[PDB]
């Protein structure tokens, strides 16, 4: 298992514009298009992202290209961020994938907001971090996915995805 496989399980693959769990227009493997409620504004962003006139439908290859870009962006966001980088550097390979997952979902700035939990992780206090992460809106809104991420942090194994 690796980060791509993990996020593909968490986000799914949809080739037609859809609404994410929060009602925002998205496409492919969790690629957010826009928070505007306008489907046309979504369609427009999609055309610009892909470089072609799509009418709301993309191919598998195009979804995978957006995915490659989004994973690369998450990783560079971690490495650039003063709060996130030291945490990433402290972690083992599996737990690193879990942090990438969160950044992909919530954004660099959002994850950097989990100060307390990040510290716990850096200190390798797995159980304490797991308990703290579960108090968040994140956990309450998307509990099945958050539990998988938390378990990965708790154990350092890919068991929640097996
Ligand atoms: Cl993009």
Phi, psi of 160 (to 5 degrees): -75, -10
Is 45 one of the annotated active-site residues of the chain? no
Query: Is-contact 103 74, C-beta < 8 A?
Result: yes
Q: What is the CATH number of domain 1-162?
A: 1.10.530.40
Tokens (6 digits) for 162: 């097996």
In order of 56, 78, 140, 149, the CA distances from 152 in angstroms are 35, 18, 18, 5
- Cβ density class 25-50: b for 16+ within 10 Å, e for less: bbbbbbbbbbeeeeeeebbebbeebb
- Consult the annotation and say whether 2 binds a ligand: no
Query: Is 117 annotated for ligand binding?
Result: yes
Q: Are 24 and 7 in contact (CB under 8 A)?
A: no
Q: E strands along the chain, which residues?
A: 14-19, 25-28, 31-34
* CA 66–ligand 1 middle distance (angstroms): 6
Is residue 53 part of an annotated ligand binding site? no
Q: What is the resolution of this structure in A?
A: 1.7
Q: Which of 5, 10, 20, 127 is catalytic?
A: 20
In 10 A of CB 76, how many CB atoms?
A: 11
């Amino acid at each position: 298992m690796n980060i791509f496989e993990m996020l593909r399980i968490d986000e799914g693959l949809r080739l037609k514009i859809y609404k994410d769990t929060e009602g925002y227009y998205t496409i492919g493997i969790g690629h957010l298009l826009t928070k505007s409620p306008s489907l046309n504004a979504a369609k427009e962003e999609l055309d610009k992202a892909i470089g072609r006139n799509t009418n709301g439908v993309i191919t598998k290859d195009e979804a995978e290209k957006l995915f490659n870009q989004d994973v690369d962006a998450a990783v560079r966001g971690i490495l650039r961020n003063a709060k996130l980088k030291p945490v990433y550097d402290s972690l083992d390979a599996v737990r690193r994938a879990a942090l990438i997952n969160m950044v992909f979902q919530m954004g660099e700035t959002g994850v950097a907001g989990f100060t307390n939990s990040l510290r716990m992780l850096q200190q390798k206090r797995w159980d304490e971090a797991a308990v703290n992460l579960a108090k968040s809106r994140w956990y309450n809104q998307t509990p099945n996915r958050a539990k998988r991420v938390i378990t990965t942090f708790r154990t350092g194994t890919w068991d929640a995805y097996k």
